[PDB]
PDB file of C-alpha atoms in Angstrom:
ATOM      1  CA  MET T   1      22.525   1.471  -2.364  1.00 46.96           C
ATOM      2  CA  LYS T   2      25.219  -1.575  -3.761  1.00 46.15           C
ATOM      3  CA  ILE T   3      23.759  -0.492  -7.040  1.00 48.80           C
ATOM      4  CA  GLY T   4      20.507   1.271  -7.339  1.00 46.53           C
ATOM      5  CA  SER T   5      17.570   1.352  -5.591  1.00 45.61           C
ATOM      6  CA  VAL T   6      14.029  -0.049  -7.112  1.00 45.63           C
ATOM      7  CA  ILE T   7      11.616   3.011  -8.106  1.00 45.71           C
ATOM      8  CA  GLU T   8       8.105   1.643  -9.476  1.00 43.22           C
ATOM      9  CA  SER T   9       5.997  -1.579  -9.016  1.00 40.95           C
ATOM     10  CA  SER T  10       3.316  -4.202  -9.914  1.00 40.22           C
ATOM     11  CA  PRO T  11       1.917  -6.898  -9.510  1.00 40.31           C
ATOM     12  CA  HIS T  12       2.950  -8.513 -12.435  1.00 41.43           C
ATOM     13  CA  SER T  13       6.705  -6.209 -13.222  1.00 40.25           C
ATOM     14  CA  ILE T  14       9.078  -4.570 -10.726  1.00 40.64           C
ATOM     15  CA  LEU T  15      10.897  -1.830 -11.903  1.00 42.54           C
ATOM     16  CA  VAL T  16      15.073  -0.210 -10.981  1.00 45.41           C
ATOM     17  CA  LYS T  17      17.121   2.423 -11.750  1.00 43.96           C
ATOM     18  CA  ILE T  18      20.278   2.189 -12.003  1.00 45.86           C
ATOM     19  CA  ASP T  19      23.126   5.648 -11.211  1.00 46.61           C
ATOM     20  CA  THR T  20      25.335   6.087 -14.151  1.00 44.90           C
ATOM     21  CA  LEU T  21      28.432   6.154 -15.470  1.00 47.49           C
ATOM     22  CA  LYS T  22      31.303   4.323 -12.997  1.00 45.57           C
ATOM     23  CA  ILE T  23      28.634   1.729 -11.336  1.00 45.84           C
ATOM     24  CA  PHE T  24      27.189   0.187 -15.198  1.00 47.45           C
ATOM     25  CA  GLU T  25      30.373  -0.182 -16.354  1.00 47.94           C
ATOM     26  CA  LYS T  26      32.430  -1.406 -13.666  1.00 46.76           C
ATOM     27  CA  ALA T  27      29.595  -4.330 -13.556  1.00 44.66           C
ATOM     28  CA  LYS T  28      28.568  -4.405 -17.743  1.00 45.19           C
ATOM     29  CA  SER T  29      30.166  -7.783 -16.888  1.00 43.78           C
ATOM     30  CA  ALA T  30      26.882  -9.142 -14.279  1.00 46.72           C
ATOM     31  CA  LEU T  31      23.941  -6.514 -15.976  1.00 52.28           C
ATOM     32  CA  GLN T  32      22.783  -8.471 -19.186  1.00 50.23           C
ATOM     33  CA  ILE T  33      18.819 -10.527 -19.902  1.00 51.40           C
ATOM     34  CA  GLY T  34      18.071 -13.207 -18.166  1.00 50.92           C
ATOM     35  CA  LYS T  35      20.952 -12.520 -15.725  1.00 50.98           C
ATOM     36  CA  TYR T  36      19.899 -13.217 -11.893  1.00 53.77           C
ATOM     37  CA  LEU T  37      19.153 -10.247  -9.631  1.00 53.30           C
ATOM     38  CA  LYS T  38      18.816 -10.131  -5.687  1.00 54.69           C
ATOM     39  CA  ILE T  39      16.578  -7.307  -3.880  1.00 53.03           C
ATOM     40  CA  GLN T  40      16.322  -7.089   0.229  1.00 54.05           C
ATOM     41  CA  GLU T  41      12.350  -7.256   0.552  1.00 51.70           C
ATOM     42  CA  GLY T  42      12.489  -5.989   4.040  1.00 50.60           C
ATOM     43  CA  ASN T  43      14.919  -6.519   6.509  1.00 53.11           C
ATOM     44  CA  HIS T  44      16.422 -10.324   6.348  1.00 50.72           C
ATOM     45  CA  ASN T  45      14.403 -11.538   2.875  1.00 47.74           C
ATOM     46  CA  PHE T  46      15.657 -11.675  -0.518  1.00 45.94           C
ATOM     47  CA  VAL T  47      13.930 -11.927  -3.323  1.00 44.72           C
ATOM     48  CA  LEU T  48      15.097 -12.684  -6.765  1.00 45.05           C
ATOM     49  CA  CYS T  49      14.787 -11.693  -9.906  1.00 41.87           C
ATOM     50  CA  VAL T  50      15.793 -12.043 -13.925  1.00 40.54           C
ATOM     51  CA  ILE T  51      16.332  -9.483 -16.306  1.00 46.56           C
ATOM     52  CA  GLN T  52      14.179  -8.714 -19.067  1.00 50.08           C
ATOM     53  CA  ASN T  53      14.850  -5.312 -20.513  1.00 51.89           C
ATOM     54  CA  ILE T  54      17.500  -2.515 -19.828  1.00 53.63           C
ATOM     55  CA  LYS T  55      17.405   1.018 -21.397  1.00 52.56           C
ATOM     56  CA  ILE T  56      18.742   4.445 -20.823  1.00 50.96           C
ATOM     57  CA  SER T  57      17.225   7.139 -20.888  1.00 48.07           C
ATOM     58  CA  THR T  58      18.538  11.064 -21.278  1.00 46.07           C
ATOM     59  CA  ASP T  59      16.321  13.244 -22.968  1.00 41.35           C
ATOM     60  CA  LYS T  60      15.320  16.476 -20.385  1.00 42.02           C
ATOM     61  CA  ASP T  61      18.785  15.540 -19.533  1.00 37.73           C
ATOM     62  CA  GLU T  62      17.386  12.801 -17.701  1.00 36.90           C
ATOM     63  CA  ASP T  63      20.578  10.337 -18.265  1.00 39.68           C
ATOM     64  CA  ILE T  64      20.050   7.237 -15.548  1.00 38.63           C
ATOM     65  CA  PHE T  65      19.427   3.008 -17.022  1.00 44.86           C
ATOM     66  CA  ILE T  66      16.639   1.696 -16.298  1.00 44.62           C
ATOM     67  CA  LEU T  67      15.414  -2.648 -15.924  1.00 45.15           C
ATOM     68  CA  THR T  68      12.499  -4.522 -15.800  1.00 45.84           C
ATOM     69  CA  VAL T  69      13.079  -6.567 -13.416  1.00 44.64           C
ATOM     70  CA  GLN T  70      11.017 -10.775 -12.834  1.00 42.12           C
ATOM     71  CA  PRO T  71      10.386 -12.126  -9.451  1.00 43.57           C
ATOM     72  CA  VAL T  72      11.251 -16.377  -9.092  1.00 41.77           C
ATOM     73  CA  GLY T  73      11.316 -16.460  -5.501  1.00 42.77           C
ATOM     74  CA  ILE T  74      12.135 -16.396  -2.709  1.00 44.52           C
ATOM     75  CA  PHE T  75      15.135 -17.937   0.044  1.00 42.75           C
ATOM     76  CA  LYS T  76      15.181 -17.221   3.486  1.00 42.90           C
ATOM     77  CA  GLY T  77      17.818 -17.917   6.243  1.00 42.26           C
ATOM     78  CA  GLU T  78      20.407 -20.608   3.828  1.00 41.28           C
ATOM     79  CA  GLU T  79      17.798 -22.586   2.019  1.00 42.47           C
ATOM     80  CA  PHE T  80      15.134 -21.740  -1.358  1.00 41.35           C
ATOM     81  CA  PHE T  81      11.760 -22.129  -1.453  1.00 42.83           C
ATOM     82  CA  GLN T  82       9.621 -20.799  -4.855  1.00 42.82           C
ATOM     83  CA  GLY T  83       6.738 -18.167  -5.295  1.00 41.32           C
ATOM     84  CA  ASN T  84       7.157 -15.829  -3.253  1.00 41.41           C
ATOM     85  CA  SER T  85       3.960 -13.366  -2.628  1.00 40.84           C
ATOM     86  CA  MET T  86       5.706 -10.965  -0.705  1.00 42.58           C
ATOM     87  CA  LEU T  87       7.198  -8.256  -3.314  1.00 42.34           C
ATOM     88  CA  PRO T  88      10.135  -5.190  -2.950  1.00 42.59           C
ATOM     89  CA  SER T  89       8.632  -1.233  -2.150  1.00 41.09           C
ATOM     90  CA  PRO T  90      10.670   1.308  -3.510  1.00 38.17           C
ATOM     91  CA  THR T  91      14.135   2.715  -1.838  1.00 34.49           C
ATOM     92  CA  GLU T  92      14.927  -1.131  -1.692  1.00 33.84           C
ATOM     93  CA  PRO T  93      18.942  -1.531  -2.987  1.00 33.22           C
ATOM     94  CA  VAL T  94      19.370  -4.198  -5.037  1.00 32.87           C
ATOM     95  CA  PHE T  95      22.975  -6.356  -3.802  1.00 34.61           C
ATOM     96  CA  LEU T  96      24.086  -8.124  -7.250  1.00 37.35           C
ATOM     97  CA  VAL T  97      24.622 -12.325  -7.092  1.00 35.01           C
ATOM     98  CA  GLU T  98      27.270 -14.205  -7.346  1.00 34.45           C
ATOM     99  CA  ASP T  99      27.826 -17.741  -8.622  1.00 35.18           C
ATOM    100  CA  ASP T 100      28.228 -20.164  -5.717  1.00 38.44           C
ATOM    101  CA  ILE T 101      24.552 -19.373  -4.489  1.00 43.33           C
ATOM    102  CA  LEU T 102      23.368 -20.520  -7.754  1.00 40.85           C
ATOM    103  CA  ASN T 103      25.538 -23.703  -7.188  1.00 41.28           C
ATOM    104  CA  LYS T 104      23.516 -24.449  -4.050  1.00 43.91           C
ATOM    105  CA  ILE T 105      20.116 -23.929  -5.408  1.00 43.82           C
ATOM    106  CA  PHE T 106      21.000 -26.128  -8.486  1.00 41.04           C
ATOM    107  CA  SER T 107      22.660 -28.876  -6.819  1.00 41.24           C
ATOM    108  CA  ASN T 108      21.810 -29.834  -3.814  1.00 42.97           C
ATOM    109  CA  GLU T 109      23.309 -32.665  -0.972  1.00 42.69           C
ATOM    110  CA  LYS T 110      21.916 -35.896  -2.771  1.00 45.19           C
ATOM    111  CA  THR T 111      18.168 -35.516  -4.340  1.00 41.32           C
ATOM    112  CA  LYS T 112      19.288 -38.493  -6.239  1.00 41.47           C
ATOM    113  CA  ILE T 113      21.406 -35.837  -8.598  1.00 43.89           C
ATOM    114  CA  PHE T 114      21.307 -36.176 -12.181  1.00 42.88           C
ATOM    115  CA  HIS T 115      23.968 -34.386 -14.492  1.00 41.77           C
ATOM    116  CA  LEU T 116      22.544 -32.488 -17.723  1.00 39.04           C
ATOM    117  CA  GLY T 117      25.021 -29.096 -18.396  1.00 33.46           C
TER     118      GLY T 117
ATOM    119  CA  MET O   1      -4.990  14.395   6.569  1.00 32.92           C
ATOM    120  CA  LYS O   2      -3.575  11.164   7.928  1.00 36.87           C
ATOM    121  CA  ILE O   3      -1.855   9.711   5.086  1.00 36.05           C
ATOM    122  CA  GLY O   4      -3.008  11.532   1.877  1.00 36.72           C
ATOM    123  CA  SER O   5      -6.129  12.545  -0.125  1.00 36.15           C
ATOM    124  CA  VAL O   6      -8.633  10.879  -3.332  1.00 33.40           C
ATOM    125  CA  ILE O   7      -6.697  12.512  -6.692  1.00 30.65           C
ATOM    126  CA  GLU O   8      -9.089  10.407  -9.258  1.00 31.75           C
ATOM    127  CA  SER O   9     -12.907   8.501  -8.821  1.00 31.74           C
ATOM    128  CA  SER O  10     -13.747   6.527 -10.964  1.00 31.00           C
ATOM    129  CA  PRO O  11     -16.195   3.502 -11.417  1.00 29.66           C
ATOM    130  CA  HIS O  12     -13.603   0.242 -10.843  1.00 30.49           C
ATOM    131  CA  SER O  13     -10.332   2.828  -9.660  1.00 32.61           C
ATOM    132  CA  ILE O  14      -9.606   5.256  -7.059  1.00 37.00           C
ATOM    133  CA  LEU O  15      -6.589   7.356  -7.492  1.00 32.96           C
ATOM    134  CA  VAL O  16      -4.957   8.518  -4.544  1.00 33.17           C
ATOM    135  CA  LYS O  17      -2.437  10.015  -2.966  1.00 29.64           C
ATOM    136  CA  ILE O  18       0.358  10.326   0.475  1.00 28.15           C
ATOM    137  CA  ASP O  19       0.958  13.913   0.928  1.00 28.13           C
ATOM    138  CA  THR O  20       5.391  14.046   1.442  1.00 28.77           C
ATOM    139  CA  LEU O  21       8.816  11.385   2.293  1.00 26.44           C
ATOM    140  CA  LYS O  22       8.659  11.645   5.519  1.00 28.77           C
ATOM    141  CA  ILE O  23       4.598  10.415   6.351  1.00 28.22           C
ATOM    142  CA  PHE O  24       5.751   7.096   3.525  1.00 27.78           C
ATOM    143  CA  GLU O  25       8.748   6.382   5.479  1.00 28.29           C
ATOM    144  CA  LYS O  26       6.898   6.186   8.393  1.00 29.67           C
ATOM    145  CA  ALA O  27       3.904   4.019   6.735  1.00 28.72           C
ATOM    146  CA  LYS O  28       6.447   0.931   4.489  1.00 26.77           C
ATOM    147  CA  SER O  29       5.764  -1.176   7.206  1.00 24.63           C
ATOM    148  CA  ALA O  30       2.072  -1.040   6.150  1.00 25.21           C
ATOM    149  CA  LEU O  31       1.919  -0.164   2.304  1.00 24.81           C
ATOM    150  CA  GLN O  32       2.320  -3.850   0.557  1.00 23.15           C
ATOM    151  CA  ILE O  33       0.484  -6.886  -0.734  1.00 27.45           C
ATOM    152  CA  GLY O  34      -3.189  -7.373   0.503  1.00 24.74           C
ATOM    153  CA  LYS O  35      -2.923  -4.492   2.799  1.00 22.43           C
ATOM    154  CA  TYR O  36      -5.930  -2.018   3.059  1.00 21.24           C
ATOM    155  CA  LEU O  37      -7.091   1.373   4.093  1.00 21.82           C
ATOM    156  CA  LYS O  38     -10.341   2.839   4.404  1.00 21.80           C
ATOM    157  CA  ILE O  39     -11.511   6.521   2.889  1.00 23.30           C
ATOM    158  CA  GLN O  40     -13.734   9.258   4.276  1.00 24.67           C
ATOM    159  CA  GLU O  41     -17.421   8.898   2.025  1.00 22.62           C
ATOM    160  CA  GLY O  42     -18.891  11.867   3.449  1.00 22.30           C
ATOM    161  CA  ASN O  43     -19.706  11.839   6.889  1.00 25.71           C
ATOM    162  CA  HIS O  44     -18.843   9.047   8.843  1.00 21.75           C
ATOM    163  CA  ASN O  45     -19.082   6.156   6.536  1.00 22.11           C
ATOM    164  CA  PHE O  46     -16.164   4.291   5.498  1.00 23.12           C
ATOM    165  CA  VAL O  47     -15.898   2.246   2.329  1.00 22.18           C
ATOM    166  CA  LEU O  48     -12.605  -0.339   2.123  1.00 22.92           C
ATOM    167  CA  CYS O  49     -10.137  -1.162   0.111  1.00 18.74           C
ATOM    168  CA  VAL O  50      -7.596  -3.573  -1.452  1.00 17.92           C
ATOM    169  CA  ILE O  51      -4.727  -2.937  -2.846  1.00 19.20           C
ATOM    170  CA  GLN O  52      -2.071  -5.575  -5.077  1.00 20.61           C
ATOM    171  CA  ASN O  53       1.357  -7.038  -4.258  1.00 18.56           C
ATOM    172  CA  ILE O  54       2.929  -3.863  -4.557  1.00 21.47           C
ATOM    173  CA  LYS O  55       1.429  -0.277  -3.339  1.00 25.40           C
ATOM    174  CA  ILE O  56       3.881   2.591  -5.358  1.00 24.00           C
ATOM    175  CA  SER O  57       3.953   4.486  -8.709  1.00 22.84           C
ATOM    176  CA  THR O  58       6.312   7.110  -8.247  1.00 26.97           C
ATOM    177  CA  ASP O  59       6.425  10.312  -9.795  1.00 28.46           C
TER     178      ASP O  59
END
């Protein structure tokens, strides 16, 4: 919906399809190797994944963008967990990710904060 | 029939098919990690099968 939908799947990797032209160029800053994405995976959950490979298909008049992602965890409500088993199926949109949630993940209340960089 | 038919039979895996998109939309809630399906296998002896973390391959 926001950027695209998932097409294929596997017990180790997830394959995502992204529309071309305006959508890719508008949000090309956040579409790089090593960054993060979130997938709906049902109704109220969300699965966090990291980008590993980006390709463009043009042969046989099939111009489209294809991404490979690997999950890292699932956050339910306002808290983050690790080691997710439930995984998304096709017709599931991807809704990008912001930086405030990343700040919340890496710096929780108390937890004996020790800064690194 | 109910969901689909069998494409390939092999000693280690069975390749199955789904008829159309409406069936997939209705049964999306039951095709995911660790879900179970049964195949006819002759007259009445059903065979239980297991599927992986996600169960799809759109082609």
